[PDB]
Amino acid sequence: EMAVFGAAAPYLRKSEKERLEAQTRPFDLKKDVFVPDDKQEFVKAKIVSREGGKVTAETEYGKTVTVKEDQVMQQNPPKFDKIEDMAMLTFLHEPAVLYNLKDRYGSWMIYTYSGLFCVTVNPYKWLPVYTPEVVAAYRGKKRSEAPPHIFSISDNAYQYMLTDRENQSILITGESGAGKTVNTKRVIQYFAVLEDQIIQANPALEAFGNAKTVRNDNSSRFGKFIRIHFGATGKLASADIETYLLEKSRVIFQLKAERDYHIFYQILSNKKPELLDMLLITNNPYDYAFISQGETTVASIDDAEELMATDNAFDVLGFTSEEKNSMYKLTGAIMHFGNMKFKLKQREEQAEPDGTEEADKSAYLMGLNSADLLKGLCHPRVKVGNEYVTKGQNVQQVIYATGALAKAVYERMFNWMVTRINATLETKQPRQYFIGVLDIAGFEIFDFNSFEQLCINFTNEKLQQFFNHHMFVLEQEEYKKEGIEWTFIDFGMDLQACIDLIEKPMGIMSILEEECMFPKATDMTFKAKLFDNHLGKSANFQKPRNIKGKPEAHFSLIHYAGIVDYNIIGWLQKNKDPLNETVVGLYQKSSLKLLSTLTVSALHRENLNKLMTNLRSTHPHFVRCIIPNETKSPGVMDNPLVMHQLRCNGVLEGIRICRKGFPNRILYGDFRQRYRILNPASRKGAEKLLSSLDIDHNQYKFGHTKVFFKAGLLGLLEEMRDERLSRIITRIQAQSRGVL
Amino acid sequence: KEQQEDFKEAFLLFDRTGECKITLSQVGDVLRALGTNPTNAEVKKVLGNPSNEEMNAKKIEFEQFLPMMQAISNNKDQGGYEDFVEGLRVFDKEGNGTVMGAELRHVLATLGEKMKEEEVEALLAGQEDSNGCINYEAFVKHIMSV
């Protein structure tokens, strides 16, 4: 039945008798319920009795804490434990999911369904999970029959693409560096059954598009989308790679607990004297504002070896060696743009440069004329009507202009590498029915949330909205398939409030965009408009909260993952992106590869719209990866960490949405053969049994093939079963004594 | 009246000390094997819950046996044939109607009230087939007769 998996059998499913024999354990449906904790926020405990507002709770550690009876919450039934899909569980709660996952992980059960989601914790030990025999025997297995596994959803999506003649794409969410790379590599390998090319290219993009964050030291800021183009007969054809939503403010500005992209630090390595020599670098990051503005450096991974890997990958790749020097010198020049002064002129608001030596080095790097660059920057020229007019700008305006120019040129550079690697990637085979794979940062939460964090949260909000809509559509399809259609209210508007407050005109983003246009803008009055337009006017917006002396609190919102508090300082300064057209034209006349190479809120909005439109055309599938503990050790798990990860992953949202319907769906035959003993004597039998049980009809929906129950009804029938079997045991003992 | 005489005859039969005095266990068994099945909880309730010493300390007479038997005769919570069949069905995991003796042995000796092993071997010997499985329905019929 299951032995085909060989040595992999125990991990995907213990055994027919192991889980069954372990199933019979003592439990009280009335006095073995969960209890909130203080450090882990949740612990296993038993209640002595009912004592009003106080309850005597004893946990495994050994305590006599008390909890108000209003927030006490039931515990999972014993015979429903170790369930593959939480949607079938009869008690959906925040700690129930954590306990189910923790016990599955303890029992070496890695994968776990959560409805559509497929949570996959990452054990730090070798497993036979990726054994070639496992994948060979796993082919063609349906989603339902097979145990939960990423290969299961991969095969299901493959079959759907083959049959429906429709594109399928998969999106994975989790923590990068804890197994994300391994997960995606194994997924693409399963499709393969150009892996070498993908793995050789990945380090370069990682180096270009990663920075050290407060939580993760190798955060992948940009969103990576890889399309596996197939053939008409469902044969692998080629691969395509794209990048979207690359943050540029981080390039120019760095937070106190943040670092710029790993590139600059890697080049600053001394082990390549020639590059440093021909970049004209002091070799001290503290000498430069674009780098040392944030945290100087961290041990983390070895920068020297990473740069070796990146440059060798460039060497063994489609393009030549000269452009490697070209790109290194270009990025060095980008670095050099953090040194001009441009003092204001006397008796005038015009600006005039002072330290005109870094300008010469930059021009030599780009082969342009420093005098021309200074003339253009000081007096930008624009064409109106049929003539040209030159107007000057103050120091702040030119500073913003140069920052925007650097951000734009870096973005164009990254796009150029993406195009080059993509061109080197695919082959001549015909391409059809691509399959999408998306890698993006999760709904990160910090204690000092800022503009970039707001953008990430907004993107995750849109993704969660798309997931919710897809769930609603699938549920409607299933219900109409079963002849049931009631309470069919879409879930889009449930989450649409935040989206409207963010993007819509006179919304948060629109207000931010329109405010900075005004000649005199300040953060305090910006917050004033925000409060006037949203405080009380909009439900989601509300007063911030200050707890445990957090650094600051300016305004808070209620997201899908909970209440999030943001900050206002510095947003206006870094939101503007003024692009100087004349300087762009000067680059167009430059003598270098720059010819080939060439507010942030609006660009982010348009890019997100484009990506969502692109994804709307492909059937979605979802994967989740969660770290079990802060430390690298396995087995041990930090409950607060897992709870926070689950809250940020949206799994709780999915289970909550499932709960408000009729989550329990069970077969009539099994129900009759396992629950008819209560009142023994399939439409007439089932309706009679449920009528005699004295249960209000509203708590359940009756069908023709599957019977639909709420979470609590199963538990109620469970203690009914316990009482009935106790009575049966007593009667059997009495009869046996009668025989004696 | 005739059943009263039969019960008195049984009490006389079961006397051992020759004093016409026997503890409560003998009366409980007499009722148990003569048309009623009062569980140990019912026996304690009708006898005031004798403790470990009271079980063999105090003894009652047939005159005080009349009220308790009269009351017990009014208790009809004895289950039904279909009820027992369904209750035993819960252990038919394979659906073949065969239950190995080990599972029922563990259930009886670990769940519910306790029965002495000597009672088990005296009452549950010889009906086990070569494979050690007992038909629960056949067992039901046999326990209904003897």
Cβ <8 Å between B37 and A735: yes
Last residue before each break in chain A (C–N > 2.5 Å): 193, 598, 681
Of B32, B41, B115, the CB nearest to A738: B32
Query: DSSP state, A176?
Result: T
Residue A461 gets the label, from left (phi > 0), alpha (psi -120 to 50) or beta, of alpha
Q: Of B113, B141, B144, which to mutate for an interface test with A (greatest number of A Cβ within 10 Å)?
A: B113
Q: Tell me the residue range of the domain where A707 lies.
A: 664-739
In whole angstroms, give the CA distance from residue A482 to residue A95. 32
Plot region of A455 (φ>0 → left; ψ -120 to 50 → alpha; else → beta) = alpha
Give A-chain residues touching B146 at CB under 8 angstroms. Answer: 739
Which residues, 6 or more positions from A628, have their beta carbon under 8 angstroms from its beta carbon?
A: A105, A121, A122, A123, A634, A636, A637, A638, A642
Using a CB–CB cutoff of 8 Å, tell me whether A691 touches chain B.
no
Q: Which of B77, B83, B114 to mutate to test the interface with A (most CBs of A within 10 A)?
A: B83
Question: Using a CB-CB distance cutoff of 8 angstroms, which residues of chain A are in contact with residue B119?
Answer: 740
Comparing CB atoms, the residue among A674, A725, A734 nearest residue B39 is A734
B32 CB within 8 Å of a chain A CB: yes
Distance from CA of A27 to the nearest CA of B (A): 14
Q: Do the bridges between strand A210-211 and strand A219-220 make them parallel or antiparallel, or are there none, so unpaired?
A: antiparallel
Resolution to 1 decimal, in Å? 3.8
Asked if B83 reaches chain A (Cβ–Cβ under 8 Å), the answer is: yes
Residues in chain B after which the backbone breaks (C–N beyond 2.5 Å): none
Least CB–CB distance from B84: residue in A725, A726, A731: A731
The rounded distance, in Å, linking the Cα atoms of A554 and A543 is: 8
Buried/exposed A225-254: b ≥16 CB within 10 Å, e otherwise: bbbbbbeeeeeebbbebbbbbbbbbbbbbb
Q: Does B84 touch chain A (CB under 8 A)?
A: yes
Q: Kindly report the CATH number assigned to the domain that includes residue A729.
A: 1.20.58.60
Residues in contact with A367: Cβ distance below 8 Å, sequence separation at least 6, in sequence order: A590, A591, A592
Q: What sign has the CA pseudo-torsion A106, A75, A30, B115?
A: negative
Angle between helices B2-14 and B62-73 (to 10 degrees): 120
Query: Which of A680, A730, A735 minimises the CB distance to B86?
Result: A680
Chain A residues inside the 8 Å CB shell of B92: none
CA distance A600 to A406: 13
User: Cβ–Cβ of B86/A737 closer than 8 Å?
Assistant: no
CB nearest A738 (choices: B37, B83, B86): B37
A174 is an annotated ligand-binding site residue: yes
State the Cα–Cα distance between residues B78 and B76, nearest whole angstrom. Answer: 6
Would you call B110 an interface residue with chain A, using a CB distance cutoff of 8 Å?
A: no
Q: Which has the closest alpha carbon to A573: A523, A645, A607, A532?
A: A523
User: For chain B, what is the largest distance between any 2 Cα atoms, rounded to a whole number of angstroms?
Assistant: 55
State the Cα–Cα distance between residues B63 and A208, nearest whole angstrom. 100
Mutate to test the interface with B, among A677, A726, A727 (most CBs of B within 10 A): A677
Contact B112 A733 (CB under 8 A): yes
Q: What angle do CA A344, A599, A220 make, to 5 degrees?
A: 115
Q: Which of left, alpha, beta for B97 (phi over 0: left; psi -120 to 50: alpha)? A: left
Neighbours of A185 (CB within 10 A): 16
Q: What's the half-sphere exposure (Cβ side, CA atoms, 13 Å) at A525?
A: 7
CB contact under 8 A, A740 and B79: no
Which positions of A are catalytic? 176-177, 181, 216, 219-220, 442, 444
Q: Which residues of B touch A729 (CB under 8 A)?
A: 87, 111-112
For residue A44, with 0-12 CB atoms within 10 Å meaning exposed, 13-18 middle and 19 or more buried, which class applies? Answer: middle
Nearest CA in chain A to B38: A734
